């Protein structure tokens, strides 16, 4: 449950991230696949090598979903309904994997925002990602 302050921080920080969203999503993905190899079993047909066009393209998709989540922060279940069915119902992603990606995204954010990744922004973004993760792993249809 995001407080009014979390929502402000999330919109402000993601707004900061700005045009670099897709890039950050791809890097988060690369960081996850390297640091936690088991996560690769979910992407059997992807070229998961450093810089592959597939990971970068997929990263843009993740980032745009997050941007959409940020924009409908008050009714995420509704806005993420399709992706929730995809991840929770069809792929059966173990929730631990969402904690791994989330962590890799925060690591990625920290690496590119030495001036804006304050403790409060970190805390707010962590709750947002935890919220988005719970929505994507819950079958509410």
């Amino acid at each position: 449950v995001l407080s009014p302050a979390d929502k402000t921080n999330v919109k402000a920080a993601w707004g900061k991230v700005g045009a670099h969203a897709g890039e950050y999503g791809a890097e988060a993905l690369e960081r996850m696949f390297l640091s936690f190899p088991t996560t690769k079993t979910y992407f059997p047909h992807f070229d998961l090598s450093h810089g592959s066009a597939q990971v970068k393209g997929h990263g843009k998709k993740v980032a745009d979903a997050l941007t959409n989540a940020v924009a409908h922060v008050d009714d995420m279940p509704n806005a993420l309904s399709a992706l929730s069915d995809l991840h929770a119902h069809k792929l059966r992603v173990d929730p631990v994997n969402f904690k791994l990606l989330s962590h890799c995204l925060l690591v990625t954010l920290a690496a590119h925002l030495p001036a804006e990744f304050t403790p409060a922004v970190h805390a707010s973004l962590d709750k947002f990602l935890a919220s988005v993760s719970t929505v994507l792993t819950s079958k509410y249809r």
Binding site: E27, E30, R31, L34, S35, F36, H50, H103, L106, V107, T108, A110, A111, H112, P114, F117, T118, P119, A120, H122, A123, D126
Partner: protein, 146 residues
Amino acid sequence: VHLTPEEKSAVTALWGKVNVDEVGGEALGRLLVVYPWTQRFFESFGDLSTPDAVMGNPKVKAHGKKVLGAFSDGLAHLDNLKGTFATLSELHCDKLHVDPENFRLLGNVLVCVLAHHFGKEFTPPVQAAYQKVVAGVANALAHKYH
């Protein structure tokens, strides 16, 4: 634990650049800000009511140095983390009863802090090597729970 030669080498090169007087406090400080329930273990530390009070807390800074110091210990003994943390593991598990998931959280919080300090130098390969280390440390710290 494992860590290949390149990994063990990279981890070292980076740790050499880590400030031992502040990174620990920042990691512990962010743990308290990001996961507030952890503040229940530090009531004797003073004002922790706002992120500014937390990141500025003298007790948080000082305690964080000891925390970092233990991580520095683990690094010097990657082949025996369990032994290295035996005393801390008894303290955290048997005396304080800190739930083990929190060891994993502080570990990842430290990784974020490292990324924050090193920027592009904290490459995915360097991170990967450091995730092996913090997971080793957390498992080592939760040993008395096994």
